[PDB]
């Protein structure tokens, strides 16, 4: 199948790409792949484990391997043997000039940046470019996944964001104001009849406009922020107290990271996005709002080794307060990189099973699920499970 990646040079895109061909070459085991669990067997008939990549990007590199070798020097999240060996497959992957419209002043790492608006461009011609780039790559088994970096919180207007006739006029009114980059991608792909997936905390297809579109064109889309490590753990441990009819007092979340992602989440603009999702998760799991603290600080030495520090203050039986801590220590590119593949694969399956509109049974992967207030891990996982069952 073919995958069209946004921000195709990121640590997670290339972990994907390196991963996919490592397994295809029967080199790498398939650990992490949710699509490979014993409950979804048979999925190879509609979504076999075979991949073809391409996509947009705004970082100036040669191809996809030279972007993959870069992040590896910093983190080395996989042995040098798997990279050299997949060095060839990716020398042919070459991202194309994309757009970065309204994505925070937390952006600065490319002296060269004459990209979309860089070239004195219009909404119209920008959309035509992106459309023309996915178009020439896309086939019948193609999926578009946003994996670029955290954008700020755009200001929704129901005029240009609340009716496909609006957003389409927003493009004709050259309204670069309300237009965000992650909307152009979703609109691009949903337009082209391709299934879309948003791993990032950006709105993307998460607007009324770009909901009316898929549904009107029969496209099953899904997302709103990979739930890959910390938040996984909190959406898995919080209901534990609701089951034991204890009350939580305060939850503290504290995360420190330093590569391109930690780099952009530095400011309180774009960072302000993703922070939210990992905060609000808790109300909708308990039915009460404990005092919650969630912060993400820069920490250059860890690079992609996202570390997270949690403490939960909880009360039981006789009014007592008690205490629970956990430290998460992993490399984001490892817990996220399969998800990008599981997603493509469930989305391809969905497409073929006549699934259109949003896939609220894919909540399992995301921390801001569209059209659902299912946050509990084993409960999302059951819904994910009972969905497939019902379509097999």
């Amino acid at each position: 199948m073919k995958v069209w990646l946004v921000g195709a040079y990121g640590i997670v895109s290339t972990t994907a790409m390196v991963g996919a061909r490592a397994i295809e070459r029967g080199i790498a085991p398939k650990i992490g792949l949710v699509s490979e669990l014993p409950h979804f067997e048979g999925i190879e008939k509609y979504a076999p484990f075979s991949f073809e990549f391409g996509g947009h990007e705004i970082r100036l590199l040669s191809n996809a391997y030279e972007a993959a070798k870069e992040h590896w020097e910093l983190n080395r999240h996989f042995d040098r043997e798997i990279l050299e060996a997949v060095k060839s497959d990716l020398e042919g992957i070459v991202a194309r000039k994309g757009t970065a419209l309204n994505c925070g002043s937390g952006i600065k790492e490319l002296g060269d940046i004459k990209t979309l608006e860089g070239e004195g461009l219009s909404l119209a011609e920008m959309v035509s470019r992106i459309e023309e780039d996915i178009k020439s790559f896309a086939d019948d088994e193609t999926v578009v996944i946003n994996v670029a970096s955290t954008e700020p919180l755009p200001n929704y207007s129901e005029e240009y964001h609340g009716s496909l006739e609006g957003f389409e006029r927003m493009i004709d009114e050259d309204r670069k104001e309300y237009a965000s980059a992650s909307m152009l991608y979703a609109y691009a792909a949903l337009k082209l009849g391709l299934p879309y997936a948003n791993f990032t905390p950006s709105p993307g297809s998460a607007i009324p406009a770009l909901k009316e579109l898929a549904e009107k064109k029969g496209v099953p889309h899904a997302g709103n922020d990979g739930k890959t490590g910390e938040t996984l753990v909190k959406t898995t441990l919080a209901p534990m107290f609701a089951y034991r009819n204890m009350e939580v007092v305060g939850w503290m979340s504290y995360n420190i990271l330093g590569d391109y992602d930690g780099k952009v989440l530095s400011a309180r603009d774009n960072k302000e996005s993703k922070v939210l999702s990992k905060d609000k998760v808790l109300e909708k799991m308990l039915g009460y709002s404990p005092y919650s603290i969630t912060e993400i600080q820069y920490f250059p030495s860890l690079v992609d080794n996202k570390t997270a520090f949690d403490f939960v203050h909880f009360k039981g039986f006789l009014g007592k307060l008690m205490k629970f801590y956990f430290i998460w220590d992993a490399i984001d590119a490892i817990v996220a990189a399969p998800l990008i593949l599981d997603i493509a694969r469930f989305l391809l399956f969905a497409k073929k099973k006549g699934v259109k509109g949003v896939v609220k049974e894919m909540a399992f992967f995301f921390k801001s699920p569209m059209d659902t207030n299912v946050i509990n891990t084993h409960e999302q996982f059951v819904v994910l499970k009972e969905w497939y069952s019902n379509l097999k």
Copy 2:
């Protein structure tokens, strides 16, 4: 409803007894009460929150206020203000001499408190008086909960505990060695047709003999080792890793504390039982067996402050290892106590719905679920929600 408690002076028995009144008295919230959760609405038409207690005990102390007193001063797990408002009551509840038998090794610190073995009553005699105080205690709504010390691995008899003739023959042929104090209390309770629950890792009513002596009497019994906190977290977070298809390479479980629990668990006799119960757990939650280490250690200064250090070493995409920690800091007696009243309330209802034999669907409370393989908390929680549902 009434509740007989073997181990009447324990910190869990008094703290259950302390809260029971303090709530019925209106001087305490209903925090931590699983049967108080909105789901189980209307169970109070069968078992309303109203208790009266009594029980067996080897540590001879004056009344019930005294014991609770003794524990509040080491642990202070609630307010002394409550201590004295629960004064009159617990002054009232007086324990009865029970039996200690062929198993316990750390089960001796209350000096020459020798009772049954010190002199020489007969097996059938103790069981006679044992059933005496109970029988005389019981009534319509009596539930027999064993919340006493933990005995070691019960040297099982294929000729004695394999059938009712057996146990009834041992009990007559005075086969004292294959006999343990808790098999006893479970025999009397059941033989009187009163529901039974094993909050310890002790055999209790796990043998065939007693099971078949429960089936025949039409009585419901169900439990084995309350599932309180560390282990409670081990079966809520373990399925995480499985949900996402990660391998689990090692789990470290190190527990510390030393009131009366950590005391007897200085010896590996009755210590083995409890620990084994937290370890085997992992296997059936993910199908494979990671290298496991589980240890309980005497730390007197923490007393009931059961504190735990756990660590999960797991493998992701491409084989990268990743690390995960958590520490648990609390009083076993406050997170234990409301699961004594819950089970009792739960054990009544089931009775008045016609239930008999091992309530397999009550596994949600114990780490050693009788007659079932469902260890996952969310699996157990849903089950329970259901088993009530069909019996409503």
Copy 3:
């Protein structure tokens, strides 16, 4: 001896008060007291354990005990017996209406409080009044200490703070724009030839203009900002790396609490002073500046149980990266309180040994030691051991 405490009603203050009588009487041990370490044996002939109390307050309570209860009733930071024993003494202690000149944004409560600054007073009639309660109270063996709410970064004016005649001028000039609370407290005591010390990060006597008026008066003042919890460990553990020639790439520091302490140190004004002492420490111990983050966040669940989480990322041989974690779990008031009485006897003894001005040999108690660069805890502990001996 006699002791005046700015902010007599705070939690530290009364934990020093309560403990004092608790120990004067014989109903508590002297554990945690530094002047009771063998080395300083013979200090009692100069500063024996016996205390008389007074202070200033802007949070009018009827008496010290009344303030001892609210901090206790939320924190239960010591036995109820100790309090019950002391209540009668603390009830006899009454705070005198204090100043709040330039106390940044955090001092929200009194709202409309009138009796000192707010009572239409000038700075002249003000400064004298603060000198008229410590005039009357104080004798020959009195000493002044600041354990008040933290004060924001003081806008430094070299005219009125760089000269003693300037600060005088400041007074009849009603120069409240350069005047802050501590400064006038610290100005009065020193006026009075009364030894003075500062437990808060506030400038207090840490201006040129006061170092002069003290030496010109012949009085020994001390420190700045008490070093009670996490910077204690920092200035203890960091050199471990320096002595082992490893390099610190980054240090995380995160603290949470939620009482008055938390309250005012919830805003940028006040809390900026605290952080900087905390964080800055690192620079002076290893001789290099690694990446370091120091934060404080308002957790209204812990209160004075301030909890801190630290992360150290270090390199050794061959450039390999390594990590070390730690969590600080203790009551602030309790690790602070003994310090107060120590600083008291260590001040009189200076007074009694002739010493005037900054006693930079008491660096050991603080985060920002006045006039010195000894920040290593064992360094400042030898120093202070040296200093007693020489004056001895």
Copy 4:
């Protein structure tokens, strides 16, 4: 300078060998070296940085290079490319068959490997071979260091271990029952006018028979258990509540690993030796003997990356108990490796300065230091400073 290493095919020997070459090539930094700290400037006059490597191994292979590569294979504790660079050098390092006369009865790999002690040779017959391997390599700049597998306690005698004559007689009297493998090396070093160092919890030259051997042999020696991971932290943080007169109630030391160190320490007679130095620490530093548990457990998945879990339960002012945690995440090999050089260099210095017998001032490198009680890390460091200055 020459350095002969017992247990030369170990990850720690190998790491110092790799890091040595690397550094002398100007291609590897100087981090981790105590001897390269400014204070010790001029050290270069007697013991520059250049090493010549040889040593004894009982698991003889082709060279040091394939042993280093093996270790690297699993641990990956340094840049792949450094081993290539150094490769040709270690390749030309071929240890010889050492000997493990009495290591208990718990090894698992050296199987058929024994051209030495396992070839039918007397005590006297093995020494003269062992003494013949180090001489052939030795000069006047050569030193012998012990970094072999840990050993259980030995069967001491007042006749064989209490005198070099009584000892010597034990060698040509075939009393193999007393002859430790370590003593046979240290004895071989020292009896050649060569300095020795013991980085293990194993005996070595720490018996009166050999302590006296170096006095008359006019050779300095030192060590017994190089203090690296956790225990460095212990003797560095424990003094902290001393200075503040706080009381240490209990300390918990929980270490997990799994290489040839972890593999060997399986049993406890072996484990006896190590945990001892990992326990006696606290009493010898505080004056207090708190409740201490020091434990070490296998966990194959961590290989060399030893992981320590410690907890301190400490009492404060008005009896307040409070807690302190921390986690040591790091690689054993890497922190210990540079110490081997250091110890080596500081051993050369002491020989040129006429120092014979134990070098008590070298105590800063060890957790079991000979002939002194100074355990304190800051105390051991200063003591190393002045010892060198004195000899400067």
